[PDB]
A paper describes a structure:
Based on the previous findings we selected two different orientations, L1 from rotation 4 and L2 from rotation 9, and introduced additional crystal contacts by inter-molecular disulfide bridges. [name]-[name] construct L1 has a shorter shared helix, but the molecular packing only permits binding of small targets. To test if a single disulfide bridge stabilises the [name] and allows target binding, we introduced mutations Lys1655 → Cys and Ser342* → Cys (*refers to a symmetry-related molecule) between the [name] C-cap and the N-terminus of a symmetry-related [name] domain. The Cys1655-Cys342* disulfide bridge confers sufficient rigidity to identify the [name] domain.
Author numbering: 340 to 1680
C-alpha cells in the first residue's frame, strides 16, 4: 500500500495515498496505535455507500504536517456526482480530518430563500473509516463510550474489554475512547447526528452521537475502530405547511483524534488518559471558560404587566448578593425581561419590557452589575408565540395535518406553536435575535432558551436544528443556556432542570455520565448535584453540582436568607471544584459489571478502594475529592474530604440538597481568583471562605503561601458586607476558627477594605429598596417627627413607620419640565393615613394617602405578596401613586409619612420614580377626586387604578394589560370571538376566570378614593364572553362575600359594550368597585378543546374607565340637623337589635356628622358634607334586607306586600343581579296594582337594565296593554334604543300583539327605526309567519 508520513515532535503518522486513511501512529517512545489497516475506501453520500477506486483519489503532501485528497464520489443511478476535498493535518499528538470543499456536479447551489436544491448532498460519512483502532491481540485492549442519561439511577457510560468476541457495527456514542498497547485515543466530530441514548425526556440535541464504533478482522485479531457519525451538508427540510427548504451547512465536516500515553501517570493506560488528551481537540461551548466564576445563579422574574422587578431593582439586588458573598460572580436570568413579562410577547426578542425601564435601564443594570462580576441573560422562546407579538404571522403559525392551529398553552393569552423549520429556513428567528443584539450590544452574557426539545415547534428539534439555534445565539456574543437537563449536549453551559434539582424527578435531571463529567465538569452546570431523594448520581456526588434557589419571584421564591444559605452549602464548593480539570476518577460506585461497566477503573490502593477524583489546574495545583465509603448503607457514603495541594480544605456531610436533613460539612476554601476572567488575585486580595454547618470550633492548616503569617483577619458576611472583624493567631501554619452554624466568614492575610456600594444608582433616590441597613435612615433618608422610622425585615427590608413620622429624601437626575410617576408599595395596618408627597422648595407638587389597607397582595412574583408575612401573617402591600412634572427649579424631594400617633405600623418599600405620561386624574379645589380617566395607555405598572384580587389566591395572576396586534388580537382571526383591546393599544384583560364566586380585581382608596357620602358616575367600555359570567362588584373595606353588591353583565363578544352606574361613598371612605367572577357557567357556544379558551367565552376585557364626581346640592345647618333627627329616630331604639360591630360604625358616623354641623364657624360645605354622609349612613343602616325583599314583592304578585316595604323606607330604584328596578319586575309580570303605586313615588321610569331596556320593552313583550298606556303617560321614552338595538315598538310586534303599535305611534314612536340586527317595524311582521300583525303596519308605514 503506497503511503507517505506526516511528522510532529510528538509522533509520526503513516497515511495512505489512495484514501484519507491512517495506517499507524508511532509516538516518540515507539508505541504504535493503528488506524485502518484493511483496504476500506467507502464514502457514504445521501445514505448510499460508494467504494472508491484508485483512479477516484488524488493525493498531495502539502508539507510534513498536511495532506490534501480529492475524492471522485459518483453513482449515476442514485443521482450522486460530487468532488470531496479532504485535508489531514497533524499538530503535536493530534490528527485532524476535515472536508474542506464539497463540489456538486448536479447542482448550481441552493436557490434564493433556501429553496429546494435538487440532488443536494444532504449527508456525508466514511463508513468504517477506523481513524483509530485497538485489537483483541493488544495488552489491555478496552473501549469506553458515553451516551445521554438524565436518569440518576442509570449511568450513560460503558466500559468493556476488546476481546475476540467483541462484535459491533456503527455503534454510536456521544464519546468513544479506545485503549490498548500503552496508548489511548478518543474520536471527536462536529457531526449533528442523532442516535442511541440511555434516558432523555426530550429531543433538542440530547441525542447527539458523533462516534461510530465498528469491529473487523485484522488477520489473527478482532479490531475495533472509531469513525465519525454522518455529517449534514445541504439538508432538505419541510415546514408544517408542507413547504420544502434546503439549508446550508452549520459548519463543514470536521473530525480529530489525540493520541495519549499514561497522561495522569497512574501506571495504567485507559480512557481517562485519552480523555485528558481529548480536551485539546474537542469543541468547547462558547463562553464556557467563565462558568467556574458564576457562583450566584438566580432568576429575576416579571409577570403580567406588574413590573415586579424593574432592571434597576435587579442591580440593587446584585449589590446585596455581592456584599453577602464578598464579590463572588453571579449569573442573573431575566425571566420576563421583555414585553409585559414572562410568557408575554413571545417571540419578539428585541421588545425589552418598557415597564421595567426598557433597554436603557437593562444596559445600566448589565454595565454596572458587571463591575460586581454579575452576568445577565434573558429568557426567550422559539417554540410558542402569542397574538400580541409583532412576529405573529400566518407563516410563523405551526399548523397540524387538518390545517388547524397547533395550539399551545392558555394563561394570560392562548399560545400558538411556532413552525420551527419555517422560523429557521426563512431567516425569521435570526432577525429577531438581531433585533435584541441592536438593543444590548455587547453587554448581555447569555440567552436562556426555554422548552427547546419538547416538540412544540416541530416533531424534530434535532441536533442539526439545535446547533443552528446555538450558532445564531453564539454569533451575537451570547453564551448558550437551556431548559432540559439532557438538552443541547454540544453547546449548552447550563440546564435549568440540571441546576434546579427540585424539578422532574430522578428520570429528568442533568447528565449522568462519568465520561462527560470528567471531560467537561468545569465547562457547564449540566450535571447531577446532591438530591439524595433521587438516589444514584444524586446521593452526594463528589464533584458537588449546582443547586439553584431564587429570591426574586420565580415560582413565588422570595426567601433571601435561604438563597444565601444554599450558596454556601453547595455552590461555593461546586464552583471551587470547577477551577480544576479532572485527571483521574477511580472506584465509581455507580459503575458495575451489570450496567455495562465491567472494565471501569477499580483501584484498591487509592482511598481504601472507595471513590476518589483527582483534578488539576494549568498551574499544577491538585484537588483530591474522596468518598468516605462506597457502601450507601454506611454513614461514610456521604462523607467527602477535599484536599488542595495535599491539605484538608473541606470535610463532612453536606446538608441534603433536597432539604431533608442538615449535615456537618465544614470547609476553609482558598478562593484565589477574581470574579471576572478568573485570573489569580494578589496576596492582599487572596482569601479563604469558611463555613461550619453545625457551628462550633474547627482547626485548619492554612495554604502554603500563608504558613509564615502570625495572624489572619476574619469577617462575618452579611447583607451589609464584611462585619465583626476578628484577629486570629496563626501557630505552625494553622488557624482555629469559631463559627456560628450555617454562617459565612471570609479570611484575609491582613485588614480588608469594605466593597463600595452606592445604592439605587439611576433610581433618582439613594436606597429605594431599603438595603443600606439602619444606617440609610441617617446617611440617605432624613427622619423627622415624634414617631418611629425603622428598617424592619430579615428578608426583603422595608421601611416601618409608627406614630407621627416623616421619612424624606431629595430627588436627583430628573429631566426639567418632564412628566414623572412616583409610586411606592404600601402596607398600612393603621387607621391613620399613610402618605406619599413630592415637594419643591416647600411647595406640594403631588400628594396621595391610604387609610387601613383593604386588599391582600396576590402577586406571586412580587416581593411582598400575602404569603410573605410583612405583619401578622399577611401582606396588604399595593402600589400608591403620585403624578408630577419635574420642576424647572431642579429642586424636588419625596416624603413617606404617617399621620396618626397610634401604635400600629405602616410598611413602605421600593420608591420608584419613572418618566410617565398619565394625566387622567383631575382633582377638586379641596384636593379630593373630581374625575379619573384611564385608557390604560400610560400605566407605569399593573392594572392601575385596579389591583388584583384573590380568585386564584397567590398566583401568576391571569389578569394583565392586553396589547394590540391587528388582526391577530381582534375578534374574527381564527376561533377568536373577542377583541383583546377595545380602545388604543392597551386594555385590562381577564382570561378564563369563570365560576369563581369571588372578586377578580378591584379599585382601592389609595388609587380611587370615594369620599364618604359623595356620588360618582362610574363608566367603562367592556367585552364579556357570556351572560352572567362576570359582574360589577360594589363594596366597602376588605371584600367579604354577602357584603358586596353585584350587577351581572350582558355578553359583549366582539362588540364593545358599555357599563355605567352610580356609586355613593361609604360612611368610612373605604368604598370601591371591581370585577367579580359569578357562579354561572360560560356559554361555550359548542366549542371543543382549545376553542373554549381562545374563543373568549370565559374572558373579560375592560377599557376607557371614567369615574366622575356628581356635585351634590348645597344644604343648610337645618337640612342636616333635621337629617340627624330622622336617622336617629329610625335606628336609636333598635340598640344592638341588629348588630354591635355595626352599632360602633353607626355611632362613629353620627359623631362625625354632628362635629361637621356644630363646629363653631362651620359653612355650607360642612353642612352639605354632613348631610351627604347621613344619607349614606341611612343606606348602610338598611341592613334589614328591605331593598332585596321589595324586588321580591313586585315579582310574585304581592299587591299588598309592596305597600308595606315602600312606606317602611326600602330603596325606590333598588336593583337585582340583572339591574331590574321595582318598575321592570312588575311591568313584565302584568301587575298594574303594583306599577300604578310605584310610579307615584318618583321611581326611575327611564332606567336601563341588563339588556339596556326600560320597563317599556318589558310591558310590550309579555303582552300587557294596561301597563304600556299608563307608562307613556308618566313620561316614558317612546324613542328609546336599548343596548340590543330594539326600541319599545320593535319588541311589541315580535311576540304577537298589535294593539301596542297604535298606542306607541300616537306618543311619537319612530316607525323608521332599525335595530342592531337590521330589522325595521314592517320588516319584522314579514318573517312572523302571520299577516294578522302586518296589515295595520302597511296602512300607516
Ligand atoms: Mn493513566
Ligand atoms: Mn426592599
Ligand atoms: Mn385603551
Ligand atoms: Mn397579553
Amino acid at each position: 500500500v503506497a503511503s507517505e508520513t506526516l511528522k510532529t515532535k510528538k509522533m509520526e503518522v503513516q497515511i495512505k495515498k489512495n484514501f484519507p486513511s491512517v495506517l499507524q501512529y508511532t509516538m516518540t517512545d515507539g508505541k504504535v496505535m493503528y488506524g485502518q489497516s484493511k483496504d476500506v475506501r467507502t464514502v457514504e453520500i445521501n445514505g448510499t455507500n460508494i467504494e472508491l477506486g484508485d483512479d477516484d483519489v488524488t493525493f498531495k503532501k502539502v508539507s510534513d504536517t498536511e495532506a490534501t485528497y480529492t475524492l471522485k464520489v459518483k453513482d449515476e443511478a442514485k443521482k450522486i456526482d460530487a468532488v470531496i476535498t479532504v485535508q489531514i493535518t497533524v499538530k503535536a499528538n493530534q490528527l485532524h480530518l476535515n472536508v474542506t470543499k464539497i463540489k456538486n456536479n448536479l447542482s448550481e447551489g441552493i436557490p434564493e430563500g433556501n429553496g429546494v436544491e435538487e440532488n443536494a448532498i444532504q449527508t456525508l460519512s466514511f463508513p468504517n473509516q477506523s481513524l483509530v483502532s485497538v485489537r483483541s491481540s493488544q495488552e489491555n485492549a478496552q473501549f469506553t463510550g458515553a451516551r445521554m442519561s438524565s436518569n440518576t439511577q442509570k449511568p450513560g457510560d460503558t466500559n468493556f474489554a476488546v476481546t475476540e468476541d467483541t462484535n459491533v457495527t456503527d455503534s454510536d456514542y456521544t464519546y468513544g475512547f479506545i485503549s490498548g498497547a500503552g496508548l489511548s485515543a478518543g474520536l471527536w466530530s462536529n457531526s449533528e447526528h442523532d442516535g442511541t441514548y440511555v434516558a432523555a425526556p426530550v429531543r433538542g440535541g440530547s441525542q447527539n452521537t458523533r462516534v461510530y464504533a465498528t469491529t473487523q478482522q485484522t488477520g489473527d485479531a478482532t479490531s475495533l475502530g472509531l469513525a465519525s457519525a454522518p455529517w449534514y451538508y445541504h439538508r432538505t427540510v419541510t415546514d408544517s405547511k408542507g413547504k420544502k427548504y434546503t439549508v446550508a451547512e452549520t459548519a463543514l465536516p470536521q473530525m480529530a483524534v489525540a493520541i495519549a500515553g499514561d497522561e495522569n501517570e497512574d501506571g495504567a493506560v485507559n480512557w481517562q488518559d485519552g480523555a485528558i488528551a481529548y480536551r485539546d481537540i474537542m469543541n468547547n461551548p462558547y463562553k464556557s471558560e467563565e462558568v467556574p466564576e458564576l457562583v450566584a445563579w438566580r432568576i429575576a422574574m416579571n409577570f403580567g404587566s406588574q413590573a415586579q422587578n424593574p432592571f434597576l431593582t435587579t442591580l440593587d439586588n446584585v449589590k446585596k448578593v455581592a456584599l453577602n458573598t464578598d464579590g463572588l460572580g453571579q449569573s442573573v436570568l431575566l425571566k420576563g425581561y421583555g414585553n409585559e413579562g414572562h410568557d408575554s410577547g413571545h417571540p419578539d426578542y428585541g421588545d425589552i419590557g418598557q415597564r421595567l425601564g426598557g433597554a436603557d435601564d437593562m444596559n445600566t443594570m448589565m454595565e454596572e452589575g458587571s463591575k460586581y462580576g454579575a452576568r445577565f441573560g434573558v429568557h426567550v422562546n422559539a417554540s410558542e408565540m402569542y397574538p400580541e407579538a409583532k412576529a405573529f404571522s400566518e407563516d410563523m403559525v405551526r399548523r397540524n395535518s387538518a390545517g388547524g392551529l397547533s395550539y399551545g398553552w392558555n394563561w394570560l393569552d392562548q399560545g400558538v406553536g411556532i413552525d420551527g423549520i419555517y422560523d429557521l429556513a426563512s431567516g425569521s428567528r435570526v432577525s429577531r435575535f438581531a433585533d435584541l443584539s441592536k438593543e444590548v450590544g455587547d453587554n448581555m452574557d447569555f440567552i436562556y432558551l426555554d422548552v427547546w426539545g419538547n416538540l412544540t415547534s416541530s416533531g424534530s428539534e434535532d441536533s442539526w436544528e439545535t446547533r443552528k439555534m446555538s450558532k445564531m445565539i453564539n454569533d451575537n456574543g451570547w453564551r448558550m443556556t437551556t431548559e432540559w437537563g439532557s438538552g443541547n449536549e454540544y453547546d449548552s453551559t447550563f440546564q435549568h432542570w440540571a441546576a434546579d434539582l427540585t424539578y422532574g424527578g430522578y428520570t429528568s435531571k442533568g447528565e449522568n455520565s462519568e465520561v462527560m463529567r470528567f471531560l467537561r465538569n468545569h465547562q457547564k452546570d449540566s450535571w447531577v448535584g446532591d438530591y439524595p431523594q433521587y438516589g444514584g448520581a444524586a446521593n452526594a456526588p463528589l464533584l458537588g453540582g449546582y443547586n439553584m434557589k431564587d429570591f426574586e419571584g420565580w415560582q413565588g421564591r422570595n426567601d433571601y436568607a435561604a438563597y444565601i444559605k444554599n450558596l454556601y452549602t453547595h455552590d461555593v464548593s461546586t464552583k471551587f471544584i470547577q477551577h480544576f480539570k479532572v485527571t483521574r476518577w477511580v472506584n465509581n460506585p455507580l459503575l458495575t459489571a451489570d450496567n455495562g461497566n465491567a472494565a471501569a477503573v477499580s483501584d484498591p490502593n487509592t482511598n481504601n478502594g472507595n471513590e476518589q477524583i483527582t483534578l488539576k489546574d494549568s498551574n499544577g495545583n491538585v484537588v483530591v475529592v474522596s468518598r468516605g465509603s462506597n457502601d450507601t448503607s454506611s454513614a461514610a457514603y456521604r462523607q467527602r474530604t477535599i484536599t488542595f495541594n495535599g491539605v484538608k480544605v473541606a470535610s463532612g456531610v453536606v446538608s441534603a440538597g433536597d432539604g431533608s436533613a442538615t449535615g456537618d460539612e465544614s470547609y476553609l476554601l482558598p478562593w484565589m481568583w477574581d470574579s471576572f476572567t478568573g485570573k489569580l488575585v494578589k496576596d492582599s486580595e487572596q482569601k479563604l471562605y469558611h463555613w461550619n454547618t453545625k457551628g462550633g470550633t474547627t482547626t485548619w492548616t492554612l495554604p502554603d503561601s500563608w504558613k509564615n503569617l502570625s495572624s489572619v483577619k476574619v469577617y462575618q458576611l452579611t447583607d451589609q458586607g464584611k462585619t465583626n472583624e476578628q484577629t486570629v493567631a496563626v501557630s505552625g501554619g494553622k488557624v482555629t476558627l469559631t463559627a456560628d452554624a450555617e454562617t459565612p466568614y471570609v479570611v484575609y492575610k491582613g485588614e480588608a477594605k469594605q466593597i463600595q456600594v452606592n445604592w439605587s444608582e439611576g433610581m433618582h433616590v439613594v436606597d429605594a429598596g431599603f438595603n443600606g441597613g439602619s444606617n440609610t435612615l441617617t446617611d440617605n433618608w432624613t427622619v423627622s417627627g415624634s414617631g418611629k422610622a425603622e428598617v424592619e425585615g430579615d428578608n426583603n427590608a422595608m421601611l416601618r413607620l409608627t406614630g407621627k413620622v416623616d421619612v424624606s429624601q431629595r430627588l436627583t437626575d430628573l429631566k426639567a419640565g418632564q412628566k414623572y410617576a412616583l409610586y411606592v408599595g404600601v402596607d398600612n395596618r393603621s387607621t391613620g393615613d399613610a402618605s406619599v408627597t413630592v415637594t419643591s422648595g416647600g411647595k406640594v407638587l403631588a400628594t396621595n394617602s391610604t387609610g387601613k389597607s383593604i386588599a391582600k397582595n396576590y402577586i406571586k412574583a412580587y416581593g411582598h405578596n400575602t404569603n410573605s408575612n410583612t405583619e401578622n401573617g399577611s401582606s396588604y402591600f399595593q402600589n400608591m401613586y403620585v403624578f408630577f412634572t419635574a420642576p424647572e427649579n431642579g429642586d424636588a424631594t419625596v416624603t413617606l409619612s404617617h399621620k396618626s400617633t397610634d401604635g400600629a405600623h405602616t410598611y413602605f418599600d421600593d420608591v420608584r420614580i419613572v418618566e410617565n405620561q398619565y394625566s387622567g386624574i383631575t382633582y377638586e379645589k379641596d384636593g379630593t377626586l373630581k374625575s379619573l380617566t384611564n385608557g390604560f395607555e400610560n400605566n407605569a405598572q399593573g392594572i392601575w387604578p385596579f389591583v388584583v384580587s384573590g380568585s386564584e389566591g397567590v398566583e401568576d395572576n391571569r389578569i394583565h394589560l392586553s396589547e394590540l396586534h391587528a388582526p391577530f388580537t381582534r375578534a374574527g382571526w381564527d376561533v377568536k370571538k373577542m377583541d383583546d383591546v377595545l380602545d388604543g393599544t392597551w386594555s385590562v384583560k381577564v382570561n378564563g376566570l369563570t365560576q369563581k364566586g369571588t372578586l377578580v380585581y378591584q379599585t382601592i382608596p389609595q388609587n380611587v378614593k370615594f369620599e364618604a357620602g359623595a356620588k360618582y358616575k362610574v363608566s367603562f367600555d367592556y367585552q364579556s364572553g357570556s351572560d352572567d359570567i362576570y359582574a360589577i362588584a360594589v363594596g366597602q373595606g376588605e371584600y367579604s362575600a354577602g357584603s358586596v353588591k353585584l350587577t351581572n353583565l350582558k355578553k359583549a363578544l366582539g362588540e364593545t359594550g358599555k357599563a355605567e352606574f352610580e356609586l355613593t361613598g361609604g360612611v368610612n371612605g373605604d368604598s370601591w368597585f371591581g370585577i367579580y367572577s359569578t357562579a354561572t357557567a360560560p356559554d361555550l357556544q359548542g366549542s371543543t378543546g382549545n376553542a373554549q379558551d381562545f374563543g373568549g367565552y370565559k374572558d373579560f376585557v375592560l377599557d376607557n374607565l371614567k369615574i366622575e364626581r356628581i356635585e351634590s346640592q348645597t344644604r343648610t345647618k337645618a337640612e342636616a340637623q333635621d337629617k340627624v333627627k330622622e336617622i336617629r329616630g329610625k335606628y336609636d331604639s333598635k340598640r344592638a337589635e341588629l348588630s354591635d360591630a355595626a352599632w360602633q360604625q353607626y355611632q362613629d358616623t353620627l359623631v362625625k356628622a354632628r362635629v361637621l354641623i356644630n363646629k363653631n364657624g362651620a359653612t355650607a360645605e360642612d353642612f352639605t358634607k354632613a348631610y351627604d354622609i347621613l344619607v349614606a349612613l341611612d343606606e348602610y343602616m338598611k341592613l334589614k334586607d328591605l331593598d332585596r325583599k321589595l324586588l321580591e314583592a313586585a315579582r310574585a304578585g304581592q299587591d299588598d306586600e309592596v305597600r308595606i316595604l315602600m312606606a317602611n323606607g326600602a330603596d325606590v330604584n333598588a336593583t337585582d343581579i340583572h339591574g331590574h328596578t321595582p318598575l321592570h319586575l312588575a311591568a313584565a309580570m302584568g301587575h298594574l296594582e303594583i306599577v300604578e303605586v310605584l310610579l307615584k313615588n318618583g321611581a326611575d321610569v327611564n332606567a336601563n337594565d341588563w339588556r339596556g331596556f326600560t320597563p317599556l320593552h318589558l310591558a310590550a313583550l309579555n303582552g300587557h296593554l294596561e301597563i304600556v298606556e299608563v307608562l307613556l303617560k308618566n313620561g316614558a321614552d317612546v324613542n328609546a334604543t336599548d343596548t340590543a338595538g330594539n326600541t319599545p315598538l320593535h319588541l311589541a310586534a315580535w311576540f304577537g300583539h298589535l294593539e301596542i303599535v297604535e298606542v306607541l305611534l300616537k306618543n311619537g314612536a319612530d316607525v323608521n327605526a332599525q335595530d342592531k340586527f337590521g330589522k325595521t317595524a314592517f320588516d319584522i311582521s314579514i318573517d312572523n309567519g302571520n299577516e294578522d300583525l302586518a296589515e295595520i303596519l302597511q296602512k300607516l308605514g
